[PDB]
Amino acid sequence: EQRILVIEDDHDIANVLRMDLTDAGYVVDHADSAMNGLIKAREDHPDLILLDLGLPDFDGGDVVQRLRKNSALPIIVLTARDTVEEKVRLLGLGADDYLIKPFHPDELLARVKVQLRQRTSESLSMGDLTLDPQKRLVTYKGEELRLSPKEFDILALLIRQPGRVYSRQEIGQEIWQGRLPEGSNVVDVHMANLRAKLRDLDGYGLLRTV
Numbered sequence: 001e002q003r004i005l006v007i008e009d010d011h012d013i014a015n016v017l018r019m020d021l022t023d024a025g026y027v028v029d030h031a032d033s034a035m036n037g038l039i040k041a042r043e044d045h046p047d048l049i050l051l052d053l054g055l056p057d058f059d060g061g062d063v064v065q066r067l068r069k070n071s072a073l074p075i076i077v078l079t080a081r082d083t084v085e086e087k088v089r090l091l092g093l094g095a096d097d098y099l100i101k102p103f104h105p106d107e108l109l110a111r112v113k114v115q116l117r118q119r120t121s122e123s124l125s126m127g128d129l130t131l132d133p134q135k136r137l138v139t140y141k142g143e144e145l146r147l148s149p150k151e152f153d154i155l156a157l158l159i160r161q162p163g164r165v166y167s168r169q170e171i172g173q174e175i176w177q178g179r180l181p182e183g184s185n186v187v188d189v190h191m192a193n194l195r196a197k198l199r200d201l202d203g204y205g206l207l208r209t210v
Contacts, residue, residue: 001025001026001027002026002027002047002048002116003026003027003028003029003044003045003046003047003048004021004026004027004028004029004046004047004048004049004050004112005029005030005031005037005040005041005044005046005048005049005050006018006021006028006029006030006031006050006052007031007033007034007036007037007040007041007049007050007051007052008030008031008032008050008052008054008078009032009033009034009052009054010052010054011032013052014030014032017050017108018030020105020108020109021108021109021112024109024112026112029044029046034054034055034059034060034063037049037051037063037067038063038066038067041067041071041073046073047073047074047116048073048074048075048076048112048115048116049067049073049074049075049076050076050078050112051063051064051067051075051076051077051078051095052077052078052101053077053078053079053080061089061093064077064090064093064094064095065093065094067094068093068094068095068148070146071146071148072136072137072146072147072148072149072152073149074096074097074115074116074149075094075095075096075097076095076096076097076098076099076111076112076115077090077095077097077098077099078098078099078101079098079099079100079101080100080101080102081100082100084181086098087179087180087181088180088181088184088185088186091150091176091179091180091186092184092185092186092189094148094150096115096148096149096150097111097114097115097176097179098179099111114177115149119133119134120133121133124156124159124160125159126159126162128140128141128142129159129198131152131155131156131159133152133156136149136152138152138155140198145197145198146197147194147197148193150175150176150190151190151193151194151197153175154171154175154190154191154194155194155198157171157174157175168187168188169182171187172184172186172187175187
């Protein structure tokens with residue numbers, strides 16, 4: 001049974017989400033505040049996080065960012081702002097997917113299912129870089145590496161076809177499966193983070209320091 005953390009300050013909505021998700025065979029835990037959410041996210045070992053917006057956006061964005069902070073956990077954000085800008089903001093800040101309010105319980109079960117679907121291939125490799133597309137685990141130079149789900153999926157996409165160069169639109173379409181509006185910076189921002197977590201500093205010698 002997969003576990004879901006619901007971070008929702010509106011208690012009526014939290015209850016409805018609990019009923020609906022529980023009825024689908026998920027174990028559900030509730031956090032009534034951004035702070036309780038951060039704490040449970042780090043301790044309860046959830047398989048997925050649902051986050052419904054209620055703060056000003058400096059805080060709200062910070063929350064998404066903090067939950068995203070070196071975490072492999074998928075995050076879905078509920079928003080009432082039905083705009084291209086909002087979708088680009090959330091995916092850019094590290095949400096794996098958004099859901100526009102108001103919505104039907106089935107729209108929710110569907111997005112949730114996408115995020116929690118069973119793995120695929122075996123461990124991928126390229127030199128001493130290894131990805132296990134199941135534990136969503138990756139190691140490089142012996143050192144285990146913490147990628148977000150989208151970082152992981154992008155790295156996997158590149159490694160499966162090493163000689164291939166994908167266009168921004170190609171990666172956007174493949175990785176977010178239609179959910180990311182075109183023309184944005186989201187792919188670039190994810191690449192920049194991938195380079196930072198992976199790219200080797202210049203210099204190679206027999207002795208190499210890190």
